[PDB]
């Protein structure tokens, strides 16, 4: 029967309620119970606070009008006011002290996820204070989670004016009955009922949620920890930079502050960071999820030489140049991690900080050649299978859907044996024609990769492996250097191709290296353990990057 | 005969020379003349500083090796060292104290402009100091002005090793003879001559320039103040954001820091900021030159309603949302300026600061209607000519090249009389079929606009004028508000459509409004007086925006 849920901002989706400061300020100052509340609502409909609530006057204009009402409310009550009594000072703390009621937001998100139209109905004001940005960020994080956001000072209407409620129904394109309205103020609830729609007086969150969980018939309370926000492609800013006459790199950009460049591995795309792009941004950073040369909307030239580390790095530097960025924090994974390590070893001046996921930094051996060193590792067998041009491409591009469904899998649901790849004569030789669905990705998420690789295919990516000798030589030039800039190495327990032990010596070359580890975590870190990853990176970013 | 110019970094393109600190530190500390210089070059070819110069070891690794040589150079010289003697501390100040030798850079730029292949040949090092970014920015600003940039620690070679010089010739794809090498060190010059190419020992800039001005036969010294850097389209990062299902805005992004959104006017494009995009970025900002809805690579739907201020602003807010930006400094011009004023009046929370060029903020008159108010102004006559759909489009899209060459003109070279436009029955009724070439734009710059408007045409732009009534009504809602956030109004003396006097009252609505004015400046501010504009905006940005 229900199909919509409307949440109030202050007191419901955000706490502590800004309206609640009035009372606290009173007791704290031992003022006549209500003295501040009265001056706040002096004039009812045709009152200053009402005007301010309808966008008639900015908040900075309201404050002075509010001060005077306190000089008269205290005058009639035969009382005074402290000498250090500042209305702005009071609301400033009150507003910045208001945080998102996480459990409530989660419940809202849940509803929407199970086919529900959410929306925020709040009596706000045009904030033009010198700290307005604070409130800005708040609403910025809440917006993206609700189908609608109706602001009083926006629509020129304010609760409980029955009109705005009509506006709501109209905006929700739904009849009252199929709507749930949550608010902490009773007055703002009556109207909702008078029109039909179910209401819920919100005092304490859990209680309200119970009523909600019931009236909606959907488990909201005591629910599992959900996955972090996963950005939607079509709603992302897409950027393009021409690094070379015939090489154009694509990237997804979100957030503001220190630039954090994310470099995915083989065979992925910028989408492999869908779980960290939002989080990192919200953390106060300018995430630049890349589309590494050869993948997605990035140029994918055939020439193998076009994919040797040296050239790859030079273009990344050019990328910084074209964008007007002196430095950048490089975070990689798989081949990406490899890329960032050499970004730090060859262009320190450009790296604010470097972080690798799974990929350990191992200095090339001046004596043994790559081919030899690789054959020395059974699990790297598959890398020999990637050498011959065409062979690997054939099998992988043969059935994209299968290819990705077979690769992107947890450590407990594998179906590919990198063991005797060459032996079997293929990567899928004994894999199902229609693998199950990895608990890490949905049917959709997979098809996204399918459509991407439909463009340039697997040639460009596979070339990253076809420059061992060159990459080797180039690296030998740095055997005398040392990573002395902020570095962080994150290891995956269940990664059976990039075992954590392969980095046990890293500190020898990277003295002040910090670390991270993720229990029961496969090779595809971002997908497998997105929460741990964000937590780990954000932690590291604030301590060693922001500086 | 000559066709190439190679400049050394330290001492030539940048001063004071970092190598020169050695001597100064000596005298300042009353140390044996050379004590520091010796320890610096102890070991010649197979020396620490040489290794550091060939990328064998990072700078942070070198410092310790340099310290010891001073503990031995002072030991043999029978002298000691102060207790607060720090090598890092000395080079830190020395490096950050090095600035771009402007007059030299200018001379280089001049050469290149007159068909010369420039390039930087310097013996640098991989900087991994905690202040590396400083050096990073320096080279970042120099790079873009030279065809090539050969770093010692990069190519593994170092001057005066005759090999690297060969590398140079090869990279310059030119024979010695047609090359000019400038350096402050004599030793680094001999090789150049031994191969042929002309050399110039650079002591004092003016002297070197004279020799250069001569040997090249091109006025370099005592030359006019040049125009600021004008970014090249193909070398800019292009971004796209979908604000609405069928509306996608395009923008050019450059720089890092506080986001500065530039909104052009009718009928331009993001290219109208070609002179401020670089400058502002270099000033420490993240410039986001826009492509206002209806222009260039931005969606241009036919529906007039699609261009009323309210919708235009809502999308700009959505633009911020999709990009993950809580706030942004909005700088507009012409219609753009109009847009930003209403961005501040309706979304203060989102505006870090607002600045308008030419366009004055005039609050709508509750009584008189737009149509009436406009007819009250002779010069606004043309605006009536834009009302009827199709008419205006016809004449303007008829000959793009002519249209833009007739519009974009200085205040002393006009050819269009907005006076009796309706009377004459056209905007070009009595204008030349092939106008001259405005001293503001080149033949090329013009064709860029031509190709842009070839896409969506003049329909979308012209619609900005076709929503007077709506824009009027909407604005009446803010008649009770006031711009109380950082604001800056820049007026153009010779603007005869947007006269400076039209803003004489602005302070009544914008109390703390700051101002700017530009002598003998036409309507197309950015093009006409780019230098003044940058100076003015950057000034305002650091004082009221960065905060
Ligand atoms: O666990 C599984 O079932 C499959 C894992 C497949 C990993 C592919 N990544 C890879 O080869 N990266 C290189 C990057 C450069 C260093 C060596 C590894
Ligand atoms: O000087 C010249 O020869 C030609 C100037 C042409 C100016 C066109 N700009 C314009 O109409 N802007 C509106 C923006 C909204 C307010 C009114 C002006
Ligand atoms: Mg409330
Ligand atoms: Mg020099």
UniProtKB/Swiss-Prot annotation, chains A, B:
This one is known as Bifunctional epoxide hydrolase 2
What positions are modified (N6-succinyllysine)? 54, 420, 454
- What does UniProt give as the signal peptide span? none
Which species does the entry assign this protein to?
Homo sapiens (Human)
The encoding gene is EPHX2
| Listed GO biological process terms | cholesterol homeostasis; dephosphorylation; epoxide metabolic process; phospholipid dephosphorylation; positive regulation of gene expression; regulation of cell growth; regulation of cholesterol metabolic process; response to toxic substance
Going by the entry's taxonomy, the superkingdom of the source organism is recorded as Eukaryota
Ranges in coiled-coil conformation: none
Which positions bind phosphate? 122-123
Q: Which UniProt keywords apply?
A: Acetylation, Aromatic hydrocarbons catabolism, Cytoplasm, Detoxification, Hydrolase, Lipid metabolism, Lipoprotein, Magnesium, Metal-binding, Multifunctional enzyme, Peroxisome, Phosphoprotein
Induction section of the entry: By compounds that cause peroxisome proliferation such as clofibrate, tiadenol and fenofibrate.
Instruction: Describe how its activity is regulated.
Output: Inhibited by 1-(1-acetylpiperidin-4-yl)-3-(4-(trifl uoromethoxy)phenyl)urea (TPAU), 1-cyclohexyl-3-dodecylurea (CDU), 12-(3-adamantan-1-yl-ureido)-dodecanoic acid (AUDA), 1-((3S, 5S, 7S)-adamantan-1-yl)-3-(5-(2-(2-ethoxyethoxy) ethoxy)pentyl)urea (AEPU), N-adamantyl-N[']-cyclohexyl urea (ACU), 4-(((1S, 4S)-4-(3-((3S, 5S, 7S)-adamantan-1-yl) ureido)cyclohexyl)oxy)benzoic acid (c-AUCB), 4-(((1R, 4R)-4-(3-((3S, 5S, 7S)-adamantan-1-yl)ureido)cyclohexyl)oxy)benzoic acid (t-AUCB), 4-(((1R, 4R)-4-(3-(4(trifluoromethoxy)phenyl)ureido)cyclohexyl)oxy)benzoic acid (t-TAUCB) and to a lesser extent by 8-(3-((3S, 5S, 7S)-adamantan-1-yl)ureido) octanoic acid (AUOA).
Describe its assembly.
Homodimer.
Q: Which family does it belong to?
A: Belongs to the AB hydrolase superfamily. Epoxide hydrolase family.
Catalytic residues at: 334 (nucleophile), 465 (proton donor), 523 (proton acceptor)
Q: Which cofactor does it need?
A: Mg(2+)
Instruction: Return the annotated region ranges for Epoxide hydrolase.
Output: 234-547
Q: Which residues carry this modification: Phosphoserine?
A: 369
Impact after mutating residue 521 to S: Loss of S-(15-deoxy-Delta12,14-prostaglandin J2-9-yl)cysteine-induced inhibition of epoxide hydrolase activity
Lipidated residues (S-(15-deoxy-Delta12,14-prostaglandin J2-9-yl)cysteine): 521
Tell me what happens on changing residue 8 to A: Loss of phosphatase activity
Q: Which reaction does it catalyse?
A: an epoxide + H2O = an ethanediol; (9S,10S)-10-hydroxy-9-(phosphooxy)octadecanoate + H2O = (9S,10S)-9,10-dihydroxyoctadecanoate + phosphate; 12-phosphooxy-(9Z)-octadecenoate + H2O = 12-hydroxy-(9Z)-octadecenoate + phosphate; 12-phosphooxy-(9E)-octadecenoate + H2O = 12-hydroxy-(9E)-octadecenoate + phosphate
Domain AB hydrolase-1: from-to ranges: 258-530
Q: Where is this region: Phosphatase?
A: 1-223
Give TM segment ranges.
none
């Amino acid at each position: 029967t229900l199909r919509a849920a409307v949440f109030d901002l202050d007191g419901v989706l955000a706490l502590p309620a800004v309206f609640g400061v009035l009372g606290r300020t009173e007791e704290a100052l031992a003022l006549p119970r209500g003295l501040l509340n009265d001056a706040f609502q002096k004039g009812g409909p045709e009152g200053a606070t009402t005007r301010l609530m309808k966008g008639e006057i900015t908040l900075s204009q309201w404050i002075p009008l509010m001060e005077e009402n306190c000089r008269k409310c205290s005058e009639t009550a035969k009382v005074c006011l402290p000498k250090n009594f500042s209305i702005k000072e009071i609301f400033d703390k009150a507003i910045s002290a208001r945080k998102i009621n996480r459990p409530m937001l989660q419940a809202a998100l849940m509803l929407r996820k199970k086919g529900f139209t959410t929306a925020i109905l709040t009596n706000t004001w045009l904030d033009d204070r010198a700290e307005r940005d604070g409130l800005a960020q708040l609403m910025c994080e809440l917006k993206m989670h609700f189908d609608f956001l109706i602001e009083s000072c926006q629509v020129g209407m304010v609760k409980p004016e029955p009109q705005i409620y009509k506006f709501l129904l109209d905006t929700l394109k739904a009849s009252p009955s199929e709507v749930v309205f949550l608010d902490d103020i009773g007055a703002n609830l009556k109207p909702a009922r008078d029109l039909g729609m179910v209401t819920i007086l919100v005092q304490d969150t859990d209680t309200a949620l119970k009523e909600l969980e019931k009236v909606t018939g959907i488990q909201l309370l005591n629910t599992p920890a959900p996955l972090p926000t996963s950005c939607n492609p079509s709603d992302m800013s897409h950027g393009y930079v021409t690094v070379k006459p015939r090489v154009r790199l694509h990237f997804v950009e979100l957030g503001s502050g220190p630039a954090v460049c994310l470099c995915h591995g083989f065979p992925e795309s910028w989408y492999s960071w869908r779980y960290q792009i939002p989080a990192l941004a919200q953390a106060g950073y300018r995430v630049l999820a890349m589309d590494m040369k050869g993948y997605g909307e990035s140029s994918a030239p055939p020439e193998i030489e076009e994919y040797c580390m040296e050239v790859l790095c030079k273009e990344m530097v050019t990328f910084l140049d074209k964008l007007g960025l002196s430095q950048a924090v490089f975070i990689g994974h798989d081949w990406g991690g490899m890329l960032v390590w050499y970004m730090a070893l060859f262009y320190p001046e450009r790296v604010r900080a470097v972080a690798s996921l799974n990929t350990p930094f191992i200095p090339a051996n001046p004596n043994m050649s790559p081919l030899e060193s690789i054959k020395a590792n059974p699990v790297f067998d598959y890398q020999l299978y990637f050498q011959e041009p065409g062979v690997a491409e054939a099998e992988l591009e043969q059935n994209l859907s299968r290819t990705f469904k077979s690769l992107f899998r947890a450590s407990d649901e594998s179906v590919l044996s990198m063991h005797k790849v060459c032996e079997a004569g293929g990567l899928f030789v004994n894999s199902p024609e229609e693998p199950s669905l990895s608990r890490m990705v949905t049917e959709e998420e997979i098809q996204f990769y399918v459509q991407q690789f439909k463009k340039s295919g697997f040639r460009g990516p596979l070339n990253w492996y076809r420059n061992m000798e060159r990459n080797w030589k180039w690296a030998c030039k740095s055997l005398g250097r040392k990573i002395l800039i902020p570095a962080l190495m994150v290891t995956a327990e269940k990664d059976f191709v990039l075992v954590p032990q392969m980095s046990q010596h890293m500190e020898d070359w990277i003295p002040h290296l910090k670390r991270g580890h993720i229990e029961d975590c496969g090779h595809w870190t971002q997908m497998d353990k997105p929460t741990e990853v964000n937590q780990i990176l954000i932690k590291w970013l604030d301590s060693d990057a922001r500086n």
